[PDB]
Each structure stands twice: as C-alpha cells, then as structure tokens.
Design a binder for these strands. Structure first.
Lengths: 218, 164
RNA sequence: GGUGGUGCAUGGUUGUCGUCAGCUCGUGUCGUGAGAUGUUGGGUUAAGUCCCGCAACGAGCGCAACCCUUGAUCUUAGUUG
RNA sequence: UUGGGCGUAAAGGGCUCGCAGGCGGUUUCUUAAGUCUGAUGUGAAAGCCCCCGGCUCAACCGGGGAGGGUCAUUGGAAACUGGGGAACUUGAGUGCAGAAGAGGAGAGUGGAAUUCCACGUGUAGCGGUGAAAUGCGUAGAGAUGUGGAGGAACACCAGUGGCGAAGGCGACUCUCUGGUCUGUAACUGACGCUGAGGAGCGAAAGCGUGGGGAGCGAACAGGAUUAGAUACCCUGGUAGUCCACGCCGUAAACGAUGAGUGCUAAGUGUUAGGGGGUUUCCGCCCCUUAGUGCUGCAGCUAACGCAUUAAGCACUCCGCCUG
C-alpha cells in the first residue's frame, strides 16, 4: 500500500542476487522494489521497535550521505536519540572505553569556556580548545549523552558503510536499516528495501520509526 | 549465540613463543601467548596473547577468551559421535569411546578436553605440530558436533528412533 | 695493599650516527600466524610542524616552547658608576 | 586400501590416433558368476583370547569354550554388478540448412625496403660511439636520379582478435584437403569416455646429399674498453637461417593446471550464431549455444591467489613424486 511512497528507486546491474526475491524489472535498468513487500517488512519493524523502546536500548542513528545528514539529524532530535551525520569512528562499540574517555574530555571542557577558568590566554583557547570544540561537536556529535552500550542501530546504506556494521554484528546486536538492493541480507536482521537517496522517503521512513518509539514512551 | 562471562573460567596456559621483529638497530623480542580457557562443564575458548612482556600477555589472552567461547555437547562425558576436523593443514580427528578410556590426546589438545569436562576422547594429531592450529583443529570440529535430541527435532523424528 | 690482569663480567661516565624527525604503548579490529593498521593518503613546515582524509580513536618519549644571553623601553635604585 | 599428493613446496607424459586392460545412459524380462544367507563337512593339539581350577601367589600348568577359511558341497534371496532377450532417446554419431576462419599441402603472382652493380649529377669526407678508432674515400665514396640482377622478410589491417590437439600458421589468388560451431529431428538406438606398450606429429639448434645465399650472423679477425676482455660496444665476417628430400625427437614443448561427464551466486566485455520484441531498417532490449578476457559469493587454499574456462563438491580411467 502506497502510504506516502513515490519511489521504486535504485540500483542497476550492480545488485546482489542474495536480494533476488525483492525487486522487479524495468527496461530502463533501474529496478522496481515491490511495494507490498516493503510495507509488510517495515510493519514488523514498526512493531518490534516499540518493544525495544520499552526495554532500554535507546535507538542509534547513523547517516553518512549528504542526503542523510539532514533528515536523520532532525528525526533523531525529534526523538532525542543519537545521530551521526559525520564520519564513523573505528570502534564506536567494541572500543567504547576510549570513546567514553574522549567524550569525557568534551563533557567538562564546556564547563571551562563559560563557567571555568576562561581567562588564561586570548589564543590558547583559539589554537587548541575551541579548535577541539569544533571537531568533537561535529565528529562526536549528538550521540554524546549515551553512557551505555545500545541494543539497536539504524543506518541508510550498509553497502556504502559496512565498516560501522561490523562490530555491531560482532557483539550480537539486532539492528534495523533501510538497505539498497546490492546490500547484505545475511548481515542485517531487518531488511527495508527502498530508495537510498530519496530525500522525502528517507525523511518518511525515519518519521515512522521515530514515531514508533514516541508512542512507546508510555 | 555468544557464551556469557557469567561462568567459572579456569584458564591454564599452553605455550609461550618469543617472537621477533627487525628494526634499524636490531631485533625486538616480544612474547606471544595463547591460553585455553573454560570451565569443566562444556564451555571452551581461547584468545591470542600479545605483549612486550611475559605476564601481560597472560592477561590479554583472557579478554578474547571471554570474547570468543564455544559450547560442546557432553553426552555421557563423551563426544556423542565421531568427527574429523580439518581447519588449516592440521587435521585432528575425534573419536568417542567408553567411560574408562581417559583423555588420550596431543600436548596442547590435552589442555583443551579437560577444560571441557569431557573425559573420554581418543584423538590423533594428523596434521602439523603447531599449537595455534591444533587448537583450531579441535574447536572447529567441536563446533560441528550435534546433539541427539536436537537432530531428531531437526528431522522431526523421535529421539529414541535415533537409537532404536 | 696493589696505576696486577680482563670495559667480551660491570655500575657510573661521556662520544657517535644527529639536535637528525623519529621509537613505541593502551583499546579496537585486520591476518590461521609472523605482523599490519594508529605513524600511511592530501596540503604544508625547521620538524611524527599541523590541518584534512582515513578502521582507527587515544596517550607516552621526542620537536618546539617555558631557561639563559644579546637586541628596545619603563618602574625602582644612583656609588667605587 | 582403511590412511596422502600434483599452480608455485618432490610430481602432469610436448601433444595426439588408438590394440589390449579399465570403467557404463534409460526401461523391462531372465539368469545367478559376483553378492547376500542358512544347513552340513572341515581349518588337529599346544599358543593368542572367554571363564574356571591347580600348584605358598605369580610366572607356569590344567579344564571348558570361542575365534581363525577370498573353504567345499547343498538349499535359499533377486535390488544393485556381471550374462542373455526386448524397448526408449537425452550421451555420442549421421542427414539436411547455414555461418566463421593467418588450419594444412601444392604450382604461380606481386608491392615497398635492404644491399649489389651500370650510369648521370655532384665534392670531402661520410661511417660509427660513453668517447674514439679500425674499416670506406680524389681510383670519386656518402647523399641524390633512372635502370638491372637477386634473395629473404611479408607494414598498414593487428585486437587478453581468428583457428589447430600441441609445436605452430599473418602479402595475394587458384587447385586439393582436415576439423570446428549453430539450426532442428529426418535417422541410428549407448554405437561412448579414457587408454600401458605400439603408431604418427612435434619451434629453434644440429646432421647427410645437392640447390640458393640480399640483409642478418655463432666461430674467428680487427679497433677500442679495461689491471685482464678469450665479453657487453664497434666495422667486417664462415656455418647457418632459405628450398626440396631424409634423420635427430629435445625446450620455461607453460595455463609451470593430464583427458572426459555433470553440478555449483553474479556482473562484465568481446568473436561466431540463433530466437523474440515495436521496427524494411539502423538500432536498442531480452532470451539463448560456443570459445574468448577481466572484477567478484559460497566453498577450496599454508599464504599469494583460484573462482561456470576451478585450484569448489563428486566419479570413471593414464602418467608422475616420496629429503
């Protein structure tokens, strides 16, 4: 059922025959994702994530495309969840201890610039401290209040970004994600076939999941 | 699944290898380690050990041991059937026997089977005499084991029908 | 007691590559393992200087800096000047 | 054998045609050589082994039993294998209709270019190197113009492009001749695969007899180079290469991968087809046989790598290896 869909969406010949049972064929080379199978698989994801919100795995969001930098951040801040619109760091989950040390450095340096000893030099902060502040507010972003190992993750393109999925797979964590047709269904537990770069659809699919956990707050 | 760390690990070592690296000045001698880790109730695992010292390699062996454990069926303190593992040029076969037969195994392999609790194994190191791959020759075969009630559930059949 | 012997028993002490831009560690992975990544790629610098990229994020010893001298000026102090 | 290998570690015969030997599609009847099984006869005793008893226990000795036979006779079993009888057509082959080709052998044909020689024109050098000399030159070289002999090589097309089993074959045309692939269905009814010895082919070198020898060129010679230069360089230079015929029968004769049959994600070009979809088209798209390459999943691998052209998983045959 076309709830608000507009797309069939994406890849030509560079497509995985693991996802053979999912698409149709157009003469244009771009393939047509079956819309009825799309709604049925995301609805069980819409069901189980509400159970996941009742337990304590908050939600993780990661988006590493220029279309993904905006829609993922606004939906995560609508939910108060954890967004990555920048690069992914090698070891955000298994290497959590040096992540928590580094985010501790950001946690108290903001105390220095407004409450702490702000008057040391007029340029010690500029060369070192505020240059640190521009980095970590981007590269460590709004996932900063995590203090936990989460039990879920949402991404946009694992074929672009297998690197983030690896340690999440390696600690037995069921994750969700919109996938491209060339992606890995052996990897992900929750398959969502849709257009990877439709700016409305990536806003649409992140709207349903953020409103899934929004209703699950009671 | 992943075996949890809510167990009683016994963790006695097997070998230590001093392992070099050649720089502008000269060599650099470090140490290698590998420790078979488990209880005596069916959970076996290990990890590598790399450091610049003896005892810190013993420490860091326990980490990947608790990251990677695996479970073995213990039917009558035996392996339930016969199997031959073949990981990486070290072949080590596994044969069950009666309960008086003890643990007849190779050097590093004998420090694996007693860290399963399983006390009835005949085995024979067909392949090479290298300590990492012989332990890889064991658990890969022990991964491919099966349980009596499980395969009857796989076949949709009676468990006693597998015996009679 | 030895300015008797061995600096291929030694402490200690300095030269030397060279004041050269390097040497590793912690965690994470990578590879059956040795090791690899971090340190490599891009742009610069006296410099592993520093930025960007980057399955790595970090930290430590180094570089520089805080130390002296000389180069300007003010305060205070003017004799044996 | 249970209980290895063969890309590079020791190992695929250079490749073929094949007698013997090896192995067999499908359906059905039948037979019982293999196979399965009973019964009987027998494999002495001591010894091993099952269990008792005896010696002060033990060792030893004794009692009883089992076991040991590709054993023979006899009677059963008929799925599979062997044998016989009869059918089916996918394997393989034949017809027919196409298409591709540097496949072979033969006699002949040219076109640039090298040199040689004849001559005009024309003067001091060209020739050659890291540098330079030897060689060539006032007897007229080199350069240049026409003409002549003669050989061998066949640009451009040229391309992980064609074809052959391999070595190999590129000017052109003719004569003669091999296989290849598609299209089905007309036919045969398993006629097939592999193959020790045996047979034939097999670049270059070399050999024997004559032919022919323009370049090129081992041996040698000369000039340098160098402490030495029996070498790289240098100008010449014999055999050779070349042809017909005969022989040697080896090579990194390489995909460092023995031949065949099936099966196991893709994506991608590219050579020859064929089928279709709108279209006479051109074309695009899709399906599909065949070699031809690259990047890739599972799995295999000691790692590099290999991956529907396997080194994946299986099977039949032949060779080879055991530091």
């Amino acid at each position: 059922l076309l709830e608000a869909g507009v797309h069939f969406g994406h890849q030509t010949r560079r497509w995985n025959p693991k996802m053979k049972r999912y698409i149709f064929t157009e003469r244009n080379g771009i393939y047509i994702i079956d819309l009825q199978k799309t709604v049925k698989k995301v609805e069980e994801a819409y069901n189980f994530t509400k159970n996941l919100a009742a337990e304590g795995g908050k939600i993780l969001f990661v988006g590493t495309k220029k279309q993904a930098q905006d829609s993922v951040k606004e939906e995560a801040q609508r939910s108060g969840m954890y967004y990555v619109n920048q690069r992914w760091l090698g070891g955000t989950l298994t290497n959590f201890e040096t992540i928590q040390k580094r985010i501790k450095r950001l946690k108290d340096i903001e105390k220095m610039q407004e409450n702490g000893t702000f008057d040391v030099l007029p340029k010690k902060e500029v060369v070192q401290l505020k240059k640190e502040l521009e980095r970590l507010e981007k590269f460590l972003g709004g996932i900063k209040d995590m203090k936990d190992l989460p039990d879920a993750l949402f991404i946009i393109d694992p074929r672009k970004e297998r690197i983030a999925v690896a340690e999440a797979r390696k600690l037995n964590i069921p994750i969700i994600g919109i996938v491209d047709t060339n992606c890995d269904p052996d990897e992900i537990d929750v398959v969502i076939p849709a257009n990877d770069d439709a700016i409305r659809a990536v806003k649409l699919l992140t709207s349903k999941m953020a409103d899934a956990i929004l209703e699950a707050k009671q | 699944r992943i075996d949890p760390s809510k167990l009683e690990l016994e963790e006695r070592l097997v070998t230590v290898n001093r392992v070099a690296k050649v720089v502008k000045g000269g060599r650099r001698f470090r140490f290698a380690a590998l420790v078979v880790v488990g209880d005596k109730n069916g959970h076996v695992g290990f990890g590598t050990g790399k450091a610049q010292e003896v005892p810190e390699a013993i420490r860091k062996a326990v980490e990947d041991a608790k990251k990677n454990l695996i479970e073995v069926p213990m039917v009558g303190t035996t392996i339930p059937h016969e199997i031959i593992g073949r990981f990486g040029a070290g072949n080590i076969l596994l044969k069950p026997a009666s309960e008086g037969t003890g643990v007849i195994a190779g050097g590093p392999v004998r420090a694996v089977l007693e860290l399963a609790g399983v006390a009835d194994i005949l085995s024979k190191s067909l392949g090479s005499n290298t300590p990492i791959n012989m332990i890889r020759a064991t658990l890969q075969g022990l991964s491919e084991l099966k349980r009596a009630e499980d395969v009857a559930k796989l076949r949709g059949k009676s468990v006693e029908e597998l015996l009679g």
